[PDB]
Write a protein that binds this ligand. Structure first.
Ligand SMILES: Cc1cn([C@H]2C[C@H](O)[C@@H](COP(=O)(O)OP(=O)(O)O[C@H]3O[C@H](CO)[C@@H](O)[C@H](O)[C@H]3O)O2)c(=O)[nH]c1=O
Ligand SMILES: Cc1cn([C@H]2C[C@H](O)[C@@H](COP(=O)(O)OP(=O)(O)O[C@H]3O[C@H](CO)[C@@H](O)[C@H](O)[C@H]3O)O2)c(=O)[nH]c1=O
Lengths: 194, 195
């Protein structure tokens, strides 16, 4: 149940537009190999062609140790997330879009044999379960620190959120993540905000 | 032992036309680190070729390899942007297999998470793992198929005519395919024209 999975997608019913993928990982002598993202194979499974249409592309990589927790971040771009090494995280999502699904959540364990498409407006987070993990993701717009005040965030430790972190009490978080607003102070995102 | 806080920069490799080496800004904090491994808008102006994206094709492959694995040398019928995604380190090795004045020209460099490389189509690519393990992530601009294997060119990592040095050959872990690739003398240079 890590190697040799069939490429396949499942909708995440709580969060419209989100897709969870099984990625084939091929193992041998040396280690392993995957096609982490393959546009031609993934469009027919539901990966949105609208992802690449502005022609923008950026690939970010974080490397985190045990109990690090990063989130929850809902910037105005789409994300394709996966793990790039032998590590594992608890992936956590909260929908911050205006409407009936505001505050809807989903959680799942992500290793290199799973990926997630996260629509713009859905807050993304994770906590590391392994000793360390390489988290790699593709995005279709460009971040700027000076612009950070305009993106949406919600505080990881708000107890009204319908999530359970692996280890909240011992989480290693950034100063920024300690200070994001609680859910009751987040304005839901309209298509106009993305 | 310079890893953090490099300014984003690119350098051509003179011996292999089209090749570019990038310094990638890696930001550390209490949690580990973060990088923008690839960023089109910032990297086009530094030399990352616009042609990479022209067909609208994209595939991202990741290999995970243990210490002493040596993979190569493979020249594929597509361009490649290579980097390391974890804490590991490789010795990267390239041999130009393109027909012309630079056929057989080589370059090597250590790659960790703070360096990436643009490898043009027709340039053979390989690496040897220096750390205990490594996550090797790359971007390519055409889609892999079993039926495309006859379009690759290969050269043997051990060919003594190659102006290259590996770290540990005694202990190198090489695939049967890679052990048996032809020597440079027996490689037919790749014509751009048809390939
Ligand atoms: C998002 C981003 C960040 N940075 C820089 C700013 C900081 O010095 C360093 C870390 O930024 P932070 O905003 O604390 O990163 P982090 O909490 O990991 O959050 C980012 O990365 C997460 C993955 O690690 C994603 O799941 C989030 O969407 C994204 O915002 O990287 C960039 O240079 N470029 C970026 O695109
Ligand atoms: C390149 C590629 C490979 N595969 C499958 C075929 C094999 O079952 C497995 C590994 O293929 P091999 O050719 O033995 O792996 P390897 O010697 O590492 O070579 C590939 O992976 C290397 C990175 O490890 C690249 O540097 C090479 O350019 C690439 O050809 O992955 C795919 O399904 N898709 C691919 O795109």
């Amino acid at each position: 149940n890590f190697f040799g999975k069939t490429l396949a997608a499942r909708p995440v019913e709580a969060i419209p537009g989100m897709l969870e993928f099984d990625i084939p990982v091929h193992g041998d002598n040396r280690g392993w190999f995957k096609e982490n993202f393959q546009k031609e194979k993934m469009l027919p499974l539901g990966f949105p062609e609208s992802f690449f249409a502005e022609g923008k592309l950026q690939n970010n990589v974080s490397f985190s140790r045990k109990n690090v927790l990063r989130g929850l971040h809902a910037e105005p771009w789409d994300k394709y997330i996966s793990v790039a090494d032998g590590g594992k995280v608890l992936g956590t999502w909260v929908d911050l879009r205006e409407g009936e699904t505001f505050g809807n959540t989903y959680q799942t364990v992500i290793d290199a044999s799973k990926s997630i498409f996260v629509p713009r407006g859905v807050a993304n987070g994770f906590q590391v379960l392994s000793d360390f993990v390489a988290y790699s993701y593709l995005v279709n717009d460009y971040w700027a620190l000076e612009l950070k005040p305009k993106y949406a965030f919600v505080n990881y430790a708000d107890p009204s959120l319908d999530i359970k972190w692996e280890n909240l009490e011992e989480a290693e978080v950034s100063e920024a993540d300690e200070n994001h607003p609680f859910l009751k102070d987040v304005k839901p995102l309209r298509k106009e905000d993305l």
